[PDB]
Amino acid sequence: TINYHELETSHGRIAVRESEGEGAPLLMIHGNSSSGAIFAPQLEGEIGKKWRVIAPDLPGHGKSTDAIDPDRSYSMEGYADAMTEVMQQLGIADAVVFGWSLGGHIGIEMIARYPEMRGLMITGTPPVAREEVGQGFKSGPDMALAGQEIFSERDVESYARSTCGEPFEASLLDIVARTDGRARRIMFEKFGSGTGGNQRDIVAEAQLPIAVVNGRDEPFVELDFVSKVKFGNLWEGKTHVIDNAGHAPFREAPAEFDAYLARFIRDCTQLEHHH
Ligand SMILES: CCCC(=O)N[C@@H](CCO)C(=O)O
């Protein structure tokens, strides 16, 4: 059973899905124009059966309302504020965080806001300073849509297919079509302007374990760039790459992805801790 409920937050009404796992909590943060529903394989599978998986919808996304104040909410740092508020309301201070793409950038901005975070895993996310956006991401037509407010029908399909990978289904179009397009435009502009904390410096200086897991056929992220990013505490000492997966290995290759995620959660929550 996945438990669905809604929170009244300062950002708006936020939808939250939780598994019934008895173990340590995992906050999973979805990507641009997606929804926590995308994490069905984890919510409903072995990960969610053991651990308390929490998969909200960002303001403007999924089953959440649009933001009360788009100018406050629709940015990497604004979303980080919102997720921190969600975790406050849920009464959970020590989650492991998994962030997918935009969600990974949000997770990076959460490091300063959510001090008892036990670890952060980022997938589809190159930590970049504002001037490095061109280096960390692959230029292309779908990448261009990340910051585009108005999507045509073909835009919705192209973006959904490229972000979610195989297998595709119609429900994904519904998720992407719902997204408040203002959120795309404002977030991307603010990202390029560096309105939040410099993510390159944040990950270099962060002491908590940071895990990096990507699909080899990533269409958005430059894996060469990612493999050169300095992390304060890179989990297992390297960035990880999964064959036969692209931007969304958690759904494209769930068993292989789950091996990494489960091991990371175990390492961050059930190993003896020494400074
Ligand atoms: C570029 C800002 C972060 C972002 O929107 N990432 C996208 C991938 C690129 O289209 C995502 O969240 O999937």
Numbering used by the authors: 2 to 276
Paper excerpt:
The crystal structure of wild-type AidH complexed with the product C4-HS (AidH–C4-HS) was determined at 1.09 Å resolution. Following the lactone-bond breakage of N-butanoyl homoserine lactone (C4-HSL), the reaction product C4-HS features newly formed hydroxyl and carboxyl groups. The C4-­HS contains the O atom derived from the water molecule. The new carboxyl group forms hydrogen bonds to Ser102 and His248. In addition, the new hydroxyl group shows a rotation of approximately 98° around the axis of the C—C bond, resulting in a stretched conformation, and perfectly stabilizes this conformation by forming a hydrogen bond to Tyr160, which shifts by 1.3 Å compared with the substrate–enzyme complex. Tyr160 clutches the substrate and the product at the active site and positions them in the correct conformation via hydrogen bonds. In addition to the catalytic triad residues, Tyr160 is suggested to play a key role in catalysis. The entrance to the substrate-binding tunnel is in the open state upon substrate or product binding. Moreover, the size of the entrance varies with different substrate acyl-chain lengths.
